[PDB]
Design an enzyme around this catalytic site. Structure first.
Site, PDB file in Angstrom:
ATOM      1  N   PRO A  84      -4.341   7.873 -24.557  1.00 43.97           N
ATOM      2  CA  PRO A  84      -5.148   9.040 -24.927  1.00 43.97           C
ATOM      3  C   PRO A  84      -6.544   9.043 -24.306  1.00 43.97           C
ATOM      4  O   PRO A  84      -7.170  10.102 -24.227  1.00 43.97           O
ATOM      5  CB  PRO A  84      -5.242   8.933 -26.452  1.00 43.97           C
ATOM      6  CG  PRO A  84      -5.034   7.490 -26.745  1.00 43.97           C
ATOM      7  CD  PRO A  84      -4.051   7.015 -25.720  1.00 43.97           C
ATOM      8  N   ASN A 139      -3.063  -4.680 -22.474  1.00 43.68           N
ATOM      9  CA  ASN A 139      -1.855  -5.439 -22.832  1.00 43.68           C
ATOM     10  C   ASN A 139      -1.017  -4.807 -23.945  1.00 43.68           C
ATOM     11  O   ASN A 139       0.039  -5.336 -24.298  1.00 43.68           O
ATOM     12  CB  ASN A 139      -2.187  -6.894 -23.209  1.00 43.68           C
ATOM     13  CG  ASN A 139      -2.940  -7.633 -22.121  1.00 43.68           C
ATOM     14  OD1 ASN A 139      -2.932  -7.235 -20.953  1.00 43.68           O
ATOM     15  ND2 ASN A 139      -3.596  -8.724 -22.501  1.00 43.68           N
ATOM     16  N   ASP A 151      -1.473   4.167 -12.431  1.00 43.36           N
ATOM     17  CA  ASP A 151      -0.985   2.940 -11.814  1.00 43.36           C
ATOM     18  C   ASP A 151      -1.225   1.717 -12.691  1.00 43.36           C
ATOM     19  O   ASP A 151      -0.399   0.807 -12.720  1.00 43.36           O
ATOM     20  CB  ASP A 151      -1.619   2.756 -10.436  1.00 43.36           C
ATOM     21  CG  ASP A 151      -1.288   3.898  -9.482  1.00 43.36           C
ATOM     22  OD1 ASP A 151      -0.135   4.383  -9.491  1.00 43.36           O
ATOM     23  OD2 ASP A 151      -2.184   4.311  -8.717  1.00 43.36           O
ATOM     24  N   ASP A 203     -12.662   0.176  -5.689  1.00 47.18           N
ATOM     25  CA  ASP A 203     -11.845   0.276  -6.906  1.00 47.18           C
ATOM     26  C   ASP A 203     -12.628  -0.119  -8.162  1.00 47.18           C
ATOM     27  O   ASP A 203     -12.601   0.594  -9.170  1.00 47.18           O
ATOM     28  CB  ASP A 203     -10.590  -0.598  -6.795  1.00 47.18           C
ATOM     29  CG  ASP A 203      -9.394   0.148  -6.218  1.00 47.18           C
ATOM     30  OD1 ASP A 203      -9.158   1.315  -6.599  1.00 47.18           O
ATOM     31  OD2 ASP A 203      -8.674  -0.448  -5.391  1.00 47.18           O
ATOM     32  N   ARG A 219     -15.934   7.168 -13.352  1.00 46.31           N
ATOM     33  CA  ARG A 219     -14.626   7.522 -13.931  1.00 46.31           C
ATOM     34  C   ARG A 219     -14.451   9.024 -14.174  1.00 46.31           C
ATOM     35  O   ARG A 219     -13.406   9.595 -13.852  1.00 46.31           O
ATOM     36  CB  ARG A 219     -14.398   6.752 -15.243  1.00 46.31           C
ATOM     37  CG  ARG A 219     -12.997   6.876 -15.828  1.00 46.31           C
ATOM     38  CD  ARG A 219     -12.079   5.759 -15.355  1.00 46.31           C
ATOM     39  NE  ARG A 219     -10.700   6.218 -15.188  1.00 46.31           N
ATOM     40  CZ  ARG A 219      -9.653   5.420 -14.978  1.00 46.31           C
ATOM     41  NH1 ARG A 219      -9.806   4.103 -14.919  1.00 46.31           N
ATOM     42  NH2 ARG A 219      -8.441   5.945 -14.832  1.00 46.31           N
ATOM     43  N   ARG A 237     -14.168   9.819  -6.998  1.00 48.27           N
ATOM     44  CA  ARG A 237     -14.976   8.614  -7.193  1.00 48.27           C
ATOM     45  C   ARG A 237     -14.758   7.571  -6.091  1.00 48.27           C
ATOM     46  O   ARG A 237     -15.672   6.801  -5.766  1.00 48.27           O
ATOM     47  CB  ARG A 237     -14.744   8.002  -8.580  1.00 48.27           C
ATOM     48  CG  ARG A 237     -13.347   7.461  -8.845  1.00 48.27           C
ATOM     49  CD  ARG A 237     -13.195   7.103 -10.313  1.00 48.27           C
ATOM     50  NE  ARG A 237     -11.815   6.803 -10.684  1.00 48.27           N
ATOM     51  CZ  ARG A 237     -11.301   5.578 -10.771  1.00 48.27           C
ATOM     52  NH1 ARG A 237     -12.046   4.510 -10.508  1.00 48.27           N
ATOM     53  NH2 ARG A 237     -10.032   5.420 -11.123  1.00 48.27           N
TER      54      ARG A 237
HETATM   55  O1  LIG Z   1      -6.249  -0.577  -4.947  1.00 42.32           O
HETATM   56  C1  LIG Z   1      -5.631   0.433  -4.142  1.00 42.32           C
HETATM   57  C2  LIG Z   1      -5.599   1.795  -4.864  1.00 42.32           C
HETATM   58  C3  LIG Z   1      -4.916   1.619  -6.240  1.00 42.32           C
HETATM   59  C4  LIG Z   1      -4.913   2.938  -7.020  1.00 42.32           C
HETATM   60  O2  LIG Z   1      -4.338   2.741  -8.314  1.00 42.32           O
HETATM   61  C5  LIG Z   1      -6.352   3.442  -7.158  1.00 42.32           C
HETATM   62  C6  LIG Z   1      -6.958   3.645  -5.762  1.00 42.32           C
HETATM   63  N1  LIG Z   1      -6.968   2.377  -4.988  1.00 42.32           N
HETATM   64  C7  LIG Z   1      -7.514   2.633  -3.639  1.00 42.32           C
HETATM   65  C8  LIG Z   1      -8.842   3.405  -3.691  1.00 42.32           C
HETATM   66  C9  LIG Z   1      -9.632   3.329  -2.374  1.00 42.32           C
HETATM   67  C10 LIG Z   1      -9.022   3.580  -1.143  1.00 42.32           C
HETATM   68  C11 LIG Z   1      -9.765   3.501   0.038  1.00 42.32           C
HETATM   69  C12 LIG Z   1     -11.122   3.169  -0.007  1.00 42.32           C
HETATM   70  N2  LIG Z   1     -11.897   3.087   1.084  1.00 42.32           N
HETATM   71  C13 LIG Z   1     -11.510   3.019   2.364  1.00 42.32           C
HETATM   72  N3  LIG Z   1     -10.283   2.821   2.850  1.00 42.32           N
HETATM   73  C14 LIG Z   1     -10.193   2.798   4.201  1.00 42.32           C
HETATM   74  C15 LIG Z   1      -8.989   2.598   4.869  1.00 42.32           C
HETATM   75  C16 LIG Z   1      -8.900   2.727   6.260  1.00 42.32           C
HETATM   76  C17 LIG Z   1      -7.686   2.515   6.914  1.00 42.32           C
HETATM   77  C18 LIG Z   1      -6.566   2.170   6.162  1.00 42.32           C
HETATM   78 CL1  LIG Z   1      -5.033   1.892   6.912  1.00 42.32          CL
HETATM   79  C19 LIG Z   1      -6.659   2.042   4.782  1.00 42.32           C
HETATM   80 CL2  LIG Z   1      -5.255   1.616   3.877  1.00 42.32          CL
HETATM   81  C20 LIG Z   1      -7.864   2.253   4.130  1.00 42.32           C
HETATM   82  C21 LIG Z   1     -11.365   2.965   4.835  1.00 42.32           C
HETATM   83  S1  LIG Z   1     -12.547   3.158   3.655  1.00 42.32           S
HETATM   84  C22 LIG Z   1     -11.723   2.925  -1.240  1.00 42.32           C
HETATM   85  C23 LIG Z   1     -10.984   3.004  -2.416  1.00 42.32           C
END
Ligand SMILES: OC[C@H]1C[C@@H](O)CCN1CCc1ccc(Nc2nc(-c3ccc(Cl)c(Cl)c3)cs2)cc1
Length: 360
Positions: A19, A54, A77, A174, A181, A187
């Site tokens: 919730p 948990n 996730d 992350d 949030r 974000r």
């Molecule tokens: O922990 C991975 C996922 C899990 C989900 O449940 C929540 C979101 N989380 C990813 C979030 C996230 C994704 C990307 C970024 N920042 C950046 N990612 C990249 C980047 C560049 C090239 C590649 Cl191939 C990838 Cl995979 C990422 C450049 S800057 C910052 C945060």
């Protein structure tokens, strides 16, 4: 996608809902966007509220699973990570993990739902539209087997991953984007722009086992697990990786990502090169050397999945079945299916088509 199973009609499902998720509107969203669709699809549900860590893990671990045809998880996730680990902790894990699962998106951190939406053939939608679509999938009752990541930490903890293990830039954002949030999915964009300005690199050691180098032979004595599947490809962390693994010469990274699906988020199409085969996952890493400019161009290109077109010489992609990551200096901050984990070293291997999800 193409179904490998189908839920019965009618069927009854357990809805595990947080919730507090979706800016505290998950229950409201279920009633408006999910409930009426389940009524037309002859799906019976019972709602269980889970707003403690948990908690859903504890429930799923103790639950009489025979009552249900499927478990639908409504938060993101993080909660699906809990449910799956809850199932794997059970003494009857091998039949328990075969209970069909469903991911319904609430707020931010909904990469698994986004991926399933993509497999189904839908456009890259978010928020309200994604929830509708993911429900429409559940209502269409089609099932598919999914890969599972088994993880081992330096403290000896054995956990599982349904989506990803991030380290470096991604994992840092992350964690740090949590204090945004309320902003929703954006974000990660703001957190990225901040960490980009104050850019740092991460010293560590990476080794992986690529698909083509899996032979008929398994290491003599692998990691002895207390319960669950045996990770045949893995050796104890005190032992070096087997000689057929690729040890990455570079030891200065901006990010390392092990990813089982197409999407990193509702608007992040990270893996356009196609869906992994059974028992295989995507592996990305970016070497130190990239400019702030190129990093940003890659992040923005992800939206439409066009980042691989840049052919950036610091970005490497390999499909793998196993990996080891040992961050230099102290403990490293990791993201496991979005969730924070701190460890000296992490390694994992992929288990093929181990659990079932509803999909298109
Ligand atoms: O922990 C991975 C996922 C899990 C989900 O449940 C929540 C979101 N989380 C990813 C979030 C996230 C994704 C990307 C970024 N920042 C950046 N990612 C990249 C980047 C560049 C090239 C590649 Cl191939 C990838 Cl995979 C990422 C450049 S800057 C910052 C945060």
């Amino acid at each position: 996608a193409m179904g490998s199973g189908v839920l019965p009609r009618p069927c009854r499902v357990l809805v595990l809902l947080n919730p507090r998720g979706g800016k505290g509107k998950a229950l409201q969203l279920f009633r408006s966007h999910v409930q009426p669709l389940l009524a037309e699809a002859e799906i019976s549900f019972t709602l269980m509220l889970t707003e403690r860590r948990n908690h859903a893990r504890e429930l799923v671990r103790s639950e009489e699973l025979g009552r249900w045809d499927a478990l639908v998880v409504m938060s993101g996730d993080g909660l699906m990570h809990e449910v799956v680990n809850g199932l794997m902790e059970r003494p009857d894990w091998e039949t328990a993990i075969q209970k069909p699962l469903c991911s319904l998106p609430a707020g931010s951190g909904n990469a698994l739902a986004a991926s399933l939406n993509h497999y189904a053939g839908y456009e890259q939608v978010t928020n309200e539209d994604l929830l509708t679509n993911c429900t429409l999938l559940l209502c269409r009752r089609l099932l598919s087997p999914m890969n599972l990541l088994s993880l081992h930490t330096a403290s000896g903890l054995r956990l599982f991953s349904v989506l990803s293990l991030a380290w470096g830039f991604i994992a840092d954002v992350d964690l740090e984007s949590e204090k945004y949030r309320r902003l929703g999915e954006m974000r990660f964009t703001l957190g990225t722009f901040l960490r980009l300005a104050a850019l740092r690199t991460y010293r560590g050691r990476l080794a992986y086992l690529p698909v083509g180098r899996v032979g008929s032979k398994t290491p003599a004595s692998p990691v002895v697990v207390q319960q669950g599947p045996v990770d045949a490809h893995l050796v104890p962390l005190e032992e070096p990786v087997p000689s057929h693994w690729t040890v990455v010469p570079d030891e200065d990274f901006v990010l390392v990502l092990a990813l089982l699906h197409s999407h990193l988020g509702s608007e992040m199409f990270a893996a356009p090169m196609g869906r992994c085969a059974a028992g295989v996952m995507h592996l990305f890493y970016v070497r130190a050397g990239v400019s702030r400019a190129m990093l940003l161009r890659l992040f923005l290109a992800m939206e439409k999945g066009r980042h691989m077109e840049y052919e950036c010489p610091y970005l490497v992609y390999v499909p793998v079945v196993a990996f080891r990551l040992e961050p230099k200096d102290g403990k490293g901050v990791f993201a496991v299916d979005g969730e924070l984990m701190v460890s000296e070293a992490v390694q994992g291997q992929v288990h093929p088509n181990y659990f079932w999800m509803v999909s298109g």
